Design a protein around this ligand. Structure first.
Ligand code: CL
Lengths: 241, 231, 250, 195, 244, 235, 111, 240, 243
């Protein structure tokens, strides 16, 4: 039974090492969510600092890949940072070679191709991570593209990742079934973040303080993460209506 | 058991069995003793023969005018490591016009042995080394294990029955450390130390091997009738 | 590090079977149905856009891909394996042909190059075979229209019409009854839509179906005018609207 | 080295090659054989830079002999000459080219025809009824143009060759110490010991 | 490390056999039968396509018979993809020889070269062998018409008549019975088709399930012509010999 | 399977220990060192009477002052001998002198542990290296595939080794002559050999300072065998 | 253009007696018309009762002496502390010099 | 590169891959070598399981390495081609660098060295081939016959056989071959070689190949009829 | 089963058992800690005195990287040294190209990526060490801890080795009782105490205390070893607290 140790086919035509890498994805027990506004793309993720000895400012699963591209990771932090460093290098090389900023979907494809190679070549293991890339692309507008250990990737209207992804997914599905549009019809990114948090609260059934969340926002020509105080202002507005 | 096929595999309790098996080869090897004062450092080694027609396998190797070691375990591995030390001592002299510090020599041996314990295909070294030397901070004695662990000591012993000599040195600590400016008395203490590890056999003229280095003493090895004085 | 897997991972068993190839074919069997039909004046390739989530934008995922202006491809099996094969197939069409002869390769020779790549994954060290079967439709001046199947082993066969994946056995039977040597392209598209409906469970419309043709030259899709000999690509992907129009006459 | 001539007659090929070897201002040898047998019915003469000539000739010889053993068969003169040309054309763009000009005289046992090939150090091959390298052709070709017939006997070929050597000995400034003559026909290769 | 997963494709059994070569031969025994018959005035190549479909485009299809140059052709039994890798190498060797010596490559020299490549995969590299057996039909001016076969072991032999693939035991017995030395091409054509007709696992032998080729000095004066039979031409020769 | 450079739980290299078993199956080779020279003798052990025994070359010259006998997988020894000869002559090129017997032996032993995943396995042959130099006089070394070499006054390797070594234990003393050593090797070879010892199935050789390394003629050895038979019948 | 060679001047002299030998050399080191040093030793004790002086281009001279001294050290290690005879040292130096046949040590050497 | 150590020692001190290579030799067709007073003869078995063979073009069992040396074998056929090719290259390489052809002993030593190298090199398996190498040294009238095997050991033989049922024909040669008086003529040498193969072969038809090598590069292969005359004469003497 | 025999193999859980076995080697090692103070960091380690023959203050465990970073580790000592050798190469090449000394967060990722690389292949073994490291850069003080998996975070206080639980409890008290912060000199005293308190888990053999520190005010942002009077003062403070 060495067909379960390396990335070769089982008799059923399955790659068990890829399937087990998917399971490593939920090892952090963190849920992430991504939605699109008119002018922005918002990504939120649960933040859990279990140890009091930790410096909470260094605990993060959201990465600034380029000026325009942000990435949130679902999976263990070593693989997350491996992917982050590579994505940063790829985005920088792309700009140098081709004279313009790497698009979100192109980077997603590139990282997905790298992931595919690990599923075919034996000496390389898959990374136990799911990578969600976000930007406001200059051609396609607000963009969400997600990569997994199988080498699969696709664009999204919105998405969710983690142990309770299904609950968040259905919650989002039901909202877009009402509105009948592919995005959050809202002008400011502040209100799109408020939407993202509100719908995560509803789906998970848990309240959040300023230190329980982590937020990333993509606008035209820059991606940035929110501070604890920026999130607090967001939480206050939610409670006041 | 299932985790001793190669050096690249931890056991469930966090042990490296191939390294531990290499450590076992040292215990099978013949006893050798090391000890020092503030002025001199001494190696004493019990050499082993195959039979009565055979010679007694050499245990002590010179690395530089101010440094050398004694071996216990696989002799070819000691040749490889001593050759590396010779080169590093030599690189220090030719490039920096500087005699290689004994402590730094230990750090280099540690790092060389370590690479063999973390990589596939290779094997750990199957030998333990006792390095003595005299540098700018005085006399020194090092114990090298092929796990990579190098330890600076006042005195020690490795090989079969080495525990007897090590206990003796642990008692004599306060005495032999004070033997300054007297090479013969320091060797006597080493010969008396290695004697605590003997059974059935005793120290003969072609059995015993002694080395010394010090303040105004280059690393020199004594064999044959040159050690009859100490028998 | 270094890739230390310099030995074959696909080997002959006592019965003469190459296990990893057989298993790759099993992965293809599980995959979504895709098909290809050759007409007198064109070829049609089609498949279902099996969307993994309704939140996912299935337009961004392209199962039917342009390889050259006159050659297109569709698959059944593992999507990521297909995606990288399309990247390699597009590049090899340039490096091993266009940069030498100054023109795009004929269908059969591009197929041959793709087949070679898949064969090498079946014999080279430290790799598994590709978990896809390809259907490559194309046109060239001296061979006319053609349709090829390529399997994980690297074997390739020319077809008048065929199907691969989930409901291939039923679909190939359906095609045998409907195919003849006098079909026009529109008739082939009609048969493709009929055949594909049998294997689809849920929604059946332009947004859930991906369909492309190799047909007449499209000068409107060339992007420039001024060179008479350059008349535009024969490959064209049908729009969501163009599919739905033909589903009313179904 | 200096002068190498070749003439193809009715039923044989005749190669004439100088005997002199000079180092500096001194003639070291006056009996040097500037030729190698590649196969029983194929002979190659050579001329060019010192050292390169023999090294190349012997290298070719080894390759043809290796082929002969492997296939238990003698390559045609045409096939051998094409192999030699390729090696020289390969050589000319090398880091340090082999500066060797050759004549290949062979009897094709299949076609029952003698064949003479002239190849220079660039890899320029030509089949000829008579050929030469260096300055040898300047003096001799006018005589060969005049006297040569394709139905000549071997004896007539040798007489025409004597006239060529005599003209060379009269008008060349260099003393090349006469020539060694060899005949290649259906029966193989033999040397004319009196010339 | 990686050793754990190594099949070790290039080792002897205790009996002194090469496992992978033997298993590759087992694979080839399930492949469509290919037959070669050598006559005084030419060579015949006949081969059976494996369980085809009505929707297969036969006239543009090639799975059995391949052209190496103008003088030499091969019949394939085994993995087609493996065979094409080798075929392209053989085509290049023939052109290399032609460029070097300015003469068409002798048949045996080409065969030995391919057979040596196969041999290499059984002795070094740790890769699986090519699951292919060839029948070489060719002509040169030294030995005239020649038939050879090679298998995954890299061993090759010369033949007057030979079969590879499925039912070779039965096929070889039938050829050995009816073959004679003074035989001609037209007779050899009939023998090849009759042998396939009796050894086939199919219910009946039809034109769509065959690939056929001849190498004849039946080319205008001292020269050699290769004829890869078209579907309609195979259909005609089946009627002529009285099989359909 | 398992690594080629793997340690056993007892602290020994599996492959080195297994190669030692192959050497035990080899034909007997004996060396005796004296102050008048070193004698090397071997059992030829022809597998058939049709095999021309003089083509069995188990005693070999490395230099004029160094000889070598082998036991075990004798094919493995060829590259060792080649290296030895090269080392010996190369040192003569660099230093205009004969190379020390120990230094030569050490150079041969350096090859031994150059195996892994370099060659794929240890050597399956042991060597008795005998020679003379000005510094340490007449010497006999035993070179193993472990990379270890011991100097010996007398040594036997091969299938009859432990029986021969016990005999060499009793017979050797520091005042042996060359003639006495020759007869002693013949005596012990005759004892451990399966077939009856004669000039065709056994070979003698020696190394002296004056004449250097010499393999003995079959006529010369035959006389030493006849001299042995008579002196054993003498009591 | 960079010239890797220079001339540091100096002169050396070796004389072999019946049971002794001398190696002498001036202590002046120069470039062009300038004096670098009035006392820069040029003749060295290399061990094993051997003395050497490499005269010409000082950088190459120093490098050669350094490598031979090193060769003496490794001769002891590799051959059981055997004394390097003068004839053996000479042959060893030939090979040290010929390593750079095509980029020579620009020195006339005497031992 | 593929570095895997395939030929390794086992606990009992055996290299199984080398020993299994000898089993491949045991399977191979019988080959025999007999040296007379002024010649050497190489006999080879051809298994008659393969008829419809083209004997003109089928690889012959005896191969010329040079004009004065030949090589026959038993074992894997494909493997033997690699050894023969290397040997032929070395033969021309020796003539090129030393200006003398190889001695039979030298050529044997080279081929045996190649076989040995393949028993302790990573990623490769041993040659499943044993060879008989025969000929005459340049300007020498003494016959030479050598044998090699997968392990890489080699030796000289007055007469030797290898391959399947070699145990039987060696038995025959050991009682029939006299060292004090070897086959004085070519006839006697060929007769003894054919007799030895007739102990094992089956039919004396196209199953026996004979190649006679004489001094000064005089090598010829006997035809079917010439051999058939030996087969006829042997059995007519046997009927008594 | 068999998933724990090879490195870089995911078990059905999604775990790399070989890395988890490397953690066992870390847990087996001696105690080491780190304390982040007002303007710097303090490192301390437990050195088990196996024998009287060990020369005091000679077998130094804490290592410096560049001139502003300190590294200490628990587990397989050679593995830790190998990691620091790499750390030094990384820090050198950073400074070579960018001129400024490597920032602590930047340095942390260099080690992190290297350790993580040794969980990607079966041809290498994971690191048998958890490493506590840090120092002072342009943005102030930073303390990090790095595990065999390649996982690392920033810390207020950190601890690893056999007595990590005891240490962690002590570190948590300091964080609670000093929200405004701890001084560099205080942190040295507290570090001594914590190692002494954590020595109850290794109480069989007696030990030697070793402390180092980087502080903007006390050491000018350079890594230095705590020696002589300041070390003895910390030992006295530690010995007073256990009694
Ligand atoms: Cl890519």
């Amino acid at each position: 039974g060495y067909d379960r140790h390396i990335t070769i086919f089982s008799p059923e035509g399955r790659l068990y090492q890829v399937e087990y890498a998917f399971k490593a994805t939920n090892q952090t027990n963190i849920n992430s969510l991504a939605v699109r506004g008119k002018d922005c793309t918002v990504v939120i993720s649960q933040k859990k600092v279990p140890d009091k000895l930790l410096d909470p400012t260094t605990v993060s699963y959201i990465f600034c890949i380029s000026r325009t591209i942000g990435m949130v990771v679902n999976g263990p932090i070593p693989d997350a940072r491996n992917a982050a460093l590579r994505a940063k290098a790829e985005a920088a090389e792309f700009r140098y070679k081709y004279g313009y900023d790497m698009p979100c979907d192109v980077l997603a494809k590139r990282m997905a191709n790298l992931s595919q190679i690990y599923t075919q070549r034996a000496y390389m293991r898959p990374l136990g991570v799911i990578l969600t890339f976000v930007s406001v692309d200059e051609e396609l507008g607000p963009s969400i593209y997600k990569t997994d250990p199988a080498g699969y990737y696709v664009g999204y209207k919105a998405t969710a990742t983690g142990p309770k992804q299904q609950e968040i997914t259905t919650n989002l599905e039901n909202h877009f079934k009402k509105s009948k549009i592919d995005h959050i019809n809202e002008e400011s990114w502040e209100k799109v973040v408020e939407f993202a948090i509100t719908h995560m609260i509803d789906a998970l059934g848990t309240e959040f303080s300023k230190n329980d969340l982590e937020v990333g926002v993509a606008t035209k020509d820059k991606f940035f993460t929110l501070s604890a105080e920026n999130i607090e202002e967001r939480l206050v507005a939610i409670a006041e209506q | 058991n299932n985790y001793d096929g190669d050096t690249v595999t931890f056991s469930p309790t966090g042990r490296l069995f191939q390294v531990e098996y290499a450590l076992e080869a040292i215990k099978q090897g013949s006893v050798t003793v090391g000890l020092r004062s503030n002025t001199h450092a001494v190696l004493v080694a019990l050499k082993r023969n195959a039979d009565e027609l055979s010679s007694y396998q050499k245990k002590i190797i010179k690395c530089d005018e101010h440094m050398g070691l004694s071996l216990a375990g696989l002799a070819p591995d000691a040749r490889v490591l001593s050759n590396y030390l010779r080169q590093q001592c030599n690189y220090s002299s030719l490039v920096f016009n500087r005699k290689l510090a004994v402590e730094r020599a230990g750090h280099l041996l540690c790092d060389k042995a370590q690479k063999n314990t973390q990589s596939y295909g290779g094997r750990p070294y199957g030998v333990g080394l006792l390095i003595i030397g005299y540098d700018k901070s005085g006399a020194h004695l090092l114990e090298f294990q092929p796990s990579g662990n190098v330890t600076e000591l006042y005195g020690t012993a490795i090989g079969a029955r080495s525990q007897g000599a090590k206990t003796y040195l642990e008692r004599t600590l306060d005495t032999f450390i004070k033997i300054d400016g007297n090479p013969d008395e320091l060797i006597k203490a080493g010969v008396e130390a290695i004697s605590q590890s003997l059974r059935d056999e005793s120290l003969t003229v072609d059995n015993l091997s002694i080395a010394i280095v010090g303040k105004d003493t280059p690393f020199t090895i004594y064999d044959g009738e040159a050690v009859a004085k100490y028998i | 590090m270094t890739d230390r897997y310099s030995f074959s991972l696909t080997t002959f068993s006592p019965s003469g079977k190459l296990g990893q190839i057989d298993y790759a074919l099993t992965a293809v069997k599980q995959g979504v149905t895709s098909l290809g039909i050759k007409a007198t004046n064109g070829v049609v390739i089609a498949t279902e856009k099996k969307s993994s989530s309704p939140l996912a934008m299935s337009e961004t995922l392209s199962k039917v891909s342009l390889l050259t202006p006159d050659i297109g491809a569709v698959y059944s099996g593992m999507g990521p394996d297909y995606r990288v094969l399309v990247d390699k197939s597009r590049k090899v069409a340039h490096t091993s042909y266009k940069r030498i002869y100054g023109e795009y390769p004929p269908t059969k020779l591009l197929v041959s190059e793709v087949a070679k790549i898949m064969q090498e994954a079946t014999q080279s060290g430290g790799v598994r075979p590709f978990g896809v079967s390809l259907l490559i439709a194309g046109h060239d001046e001296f061979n006319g229209f053609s349709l090829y199947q390529v399997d994980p082993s690297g074997s390739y066969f020319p077809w008048k019409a065929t199907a691969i994946g989930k409901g291939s056995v039923a679909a190939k039977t359906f095609l045998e009854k409907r195919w003849n040597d006098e079909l026009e392209l529109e008739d082939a598209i009609h048969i493709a839509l009929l055949t594909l409906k049998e294997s689809v469970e849920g929604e059946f419309n332009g947004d859930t179906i991906e369909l492309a043709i190799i047909g007449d030259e499209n000068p409107d899709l060339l992007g420039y005018t001024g060179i008479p000999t350059d008349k535009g690509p024969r490959f064209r992907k049908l729009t969501s609207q163009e599919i739905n129009d033909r589903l009313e006459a179904l | 080295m200096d002068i190498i001539l070749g003439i193809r007659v009715q039923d044989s090929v005749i190669l004439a090659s100088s005997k002199a070897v000079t180092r500096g201002i001194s003639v070291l040898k006056d009996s040097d054989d500037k030729t190698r047998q590649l196969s029983p019915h194929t002979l190659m003469s050579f001329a060019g830079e010192a050292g390169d000539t023999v090294q190349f000739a012997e290298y070719i010889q080894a390759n043809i002999q290796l082929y002969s053993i492997r296939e238990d068969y003698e390559l045609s003169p045409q096939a051998v000459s094409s192999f030699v040309r390729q090696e020289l054309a390969k050589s000319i763009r090398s880091r340090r080219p082999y500066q060797v000009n050759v004549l290949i005289g062979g009897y094709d046992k299949k076609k029952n025809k003698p064949e003479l090939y002239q190849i220079d150090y660039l890899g320029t091959k030509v089949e000829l009824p008579y050929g030469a390298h260096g300055y040898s052709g300047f003096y001799t070709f006018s005589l060969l143009d005049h006297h040569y017939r394709p139905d000549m006997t071997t004896e007539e070929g040798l007489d025409l060759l004597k006239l060529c050597v005599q003209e060379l000995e009269k008008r060349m400034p260099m003393d090349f110490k006469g020539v060694i003559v060899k005949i290649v026909d259906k029966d193989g290769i033999r040397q004319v010991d009196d010339f | 490390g990686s050793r754990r997963y190594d099949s070790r494709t290039t080792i002897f059994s205790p009996e002194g056999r090469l496992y992978q070569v033997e298993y590759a031969l087992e694979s080839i025994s399930h492949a469509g039968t290919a037959i070669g018959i050598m006559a005084s005035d030419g060579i015949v190549l006949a081969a059976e396509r494996k369980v085809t479909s009505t929707l297969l485009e036969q006239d543009t299809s090639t799975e059995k018979l391949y052209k190496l140059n103008d003088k030499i052709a091969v019949a394939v039994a085994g993995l087609t993809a493996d065979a094409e890798i080798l075929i392209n190498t053989a085509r290049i060797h023939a052109q290399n020889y032609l460029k070097t010596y300015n003469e068409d490559i002798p048949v045996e020299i080409l065969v030995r070269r391919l057979s040596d490549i196969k041999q290499g995969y059984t002795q070094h590299g740790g890769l699986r062998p090519f699951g292919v057996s060839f029948i070489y039909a060719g002509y040169d001016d030294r030995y005239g018409y020649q038939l050879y076969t090679s298998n995954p072991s890299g061993n090759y032999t010369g033949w007057k008549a030979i079969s590879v693939g499925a039912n070779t035991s039965a096929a070889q017995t039938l050829l050995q019975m009816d073959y004679k030395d003074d035989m001609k091409v037209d007779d050899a054509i009939e023998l090849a088709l009759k042998t396939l007709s009796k050894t086939t696992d199919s219910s009946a032998l039809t034109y769509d399930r065959l690939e056929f080729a001849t190498i004849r000095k039946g080319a205008n004066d001292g020269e050699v012509y290769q004829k890869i039979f078209k579907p309609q031409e195979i259909k005609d020769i089946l009627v002529k010999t009285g099989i359909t | 399977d398992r690594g080629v450079s793997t340690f056993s739980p007892e602290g020994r290299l599996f492959q080195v220990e297994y190669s030692l078993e192959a050497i035990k199956l080899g034909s007997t080779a004996i060396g005796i060192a004296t102050k008048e020279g070193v004698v090397l003798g071997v059992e030829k052990r022809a597998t058939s009477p049709l095999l021309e025994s003089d083509s069995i070359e188990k005693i070999v010259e490395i230099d004029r002052h160094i000889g070598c006998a082998m036991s075990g997988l004798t094919a493995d020894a060829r590259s060792m001998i080649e290296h030895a000869r090269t080392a010996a002559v190369t040192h003569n090129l660099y230093y205009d002198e004969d190379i020390n017997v120990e230094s030569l032996t050490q150079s041969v032993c350096d090859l031994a542990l150059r195996f892994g995943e370099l060659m794929s396995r240890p050597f399956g042959v042991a060597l008795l290296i005998a020679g003379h130099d000005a510094d340490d006089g007449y010497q006999l070394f035993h070179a193993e595939p472990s990379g270890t070499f011991y100097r010996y006054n007398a040594k036997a390797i091969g299938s009859g080794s432990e029986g021969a070594q016990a005999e060499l234990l009793n017979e050797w003393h520091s005042s042996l002559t060359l003639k006495e050593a020759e007869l002693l090797v013949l005596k012990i070879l005759k004892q451990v050999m399966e077939e009856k010892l004669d000039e065709n199935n056994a070979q003698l050789s020696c190394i002296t300072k004056q004449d250097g390394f010499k393999i003995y003629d079959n006529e010369k050895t035959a006389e030493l065998i006849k001299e042995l038979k008579e002196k054993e019948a003498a009591e | 253009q960079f010239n890797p060679y220079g001339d540091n001047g100096g002169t050396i002299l070796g004389i072999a007696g019946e049971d002794f030998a001398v190696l002498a050399g001036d202590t002046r080191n120069i470039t062009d018309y300038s004096i670098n040093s009035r006392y820069e030793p040029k003749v060295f004790d290399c061990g094993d009762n051997i003395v050497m002086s490499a005269n010409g281009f000082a950088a190459d001279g120093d490098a050669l002496v350094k490598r031979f001294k090193n060769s003496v050290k490794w001769y002891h290690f590799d051959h059981n502390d055997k004394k390097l005879s003068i004839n053996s040292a000479a042959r060893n130096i030939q090979h040290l010099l010929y390593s750079r046949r095509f980029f020579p040590y620009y020195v006339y050497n005497i031992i | 590169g593929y570095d895997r150590a395939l030929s390794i020692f086992s606990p009992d001190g055996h290299i199984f891959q080398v020993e299994y290579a000898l089993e491949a030799v045991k399977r191979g067709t019988c080959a025999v070598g007999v040296k007379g007073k002024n010649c050497v003869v190489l006999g080879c078995e051809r298994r008659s399981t393969l008829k419809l063979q083209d004997t003109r073009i089928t690889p012959s069992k005896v191969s010329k390495i040079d004009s004065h040396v030949v090589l026959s074998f038993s074992g894997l056929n494909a493997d033997s081609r690699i050894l023969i090719e290397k040997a032929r290259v070395e033969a021309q390489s020796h003539r090129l660098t030393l200006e003398d052809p190889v001695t039979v002993e030298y050529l044997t030593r080279y081929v045996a060295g190649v076989q040995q190298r393949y028993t302790q090199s990573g990623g490769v398996r041993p040659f499943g081939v044993s060879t008989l190498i025969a000929g005459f040294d340049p300007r020498d009238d003494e016959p030479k016959l050598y044998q090699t095997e997968p392990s890489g050991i080699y030796s000289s033989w007055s007469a030797q056989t290898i391959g399947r049922n070699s145990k039987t024909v060696r038995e025959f040669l050991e009682k029939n071959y006299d060292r004090k008086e070897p086959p004085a003529t070519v006839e006697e040498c060929v007769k003894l070689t054919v007799r030895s193969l007739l102990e094992v072969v089956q039919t004396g038809a196209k199953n026996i190949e004979i190649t006679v090598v004489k001094p000064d590069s005089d090598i010829v292969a006997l035809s079917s009829e010439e051999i058939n005359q030996y087969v006829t004469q042997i059995e007519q003497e046997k009927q008594e | 089963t068999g998933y724990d025999l090879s490195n870089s193999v995911f078990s059905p859980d999604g775990r790399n058992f070989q890395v988890e076995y490397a953690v066992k080697a870390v847990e087996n090692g001696t105690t080491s800690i780190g304390i982040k103070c007002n303007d710097g960091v303090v490192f301390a380690v437990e050195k088990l005195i196996t024998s009287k023959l060990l020369v005091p203050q000679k077998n130094v465990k804490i290592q410096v990287v560049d001139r502003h970073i300190g590294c200490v580790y628990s587990g397989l000592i050679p593995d830790g040294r190998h990691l620091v050798n790499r750390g030094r190469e990384e820090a050198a090449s950073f400074k070579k190209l960018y001129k400024t000394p490597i920032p602590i967060p930047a340095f942390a990722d260099r080690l992190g990526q290297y350790v993580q690389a040794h969980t990607l292949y079966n041809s290498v073994r994971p690191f048998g060490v958890s490493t506590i490291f840090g120092g002072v850069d342009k943005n102030g003080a930073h303390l990090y801890m790095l595990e065999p998996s390649g996982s690392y975070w920033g810390y207020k206080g950190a601890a690893t080795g056999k007595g990590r639980q005891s240490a962690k409890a002590e570190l948590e008290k300091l964080v609670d009782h000093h929200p405004e912060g701890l001084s560099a000199r205080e942190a040295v005293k507290q570090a001594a105490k914590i190692i002494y308190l954590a020595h109850e888990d290794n109480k069989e053999k007696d030990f030697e205390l070793e402390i180092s520190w980087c502080s903007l005010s006390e050491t000018n942002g350079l890594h230095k070893f705590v020696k002589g009077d300041l070390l003895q003062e910390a030992i006295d403070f530690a010995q007073k607290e256990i009694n």
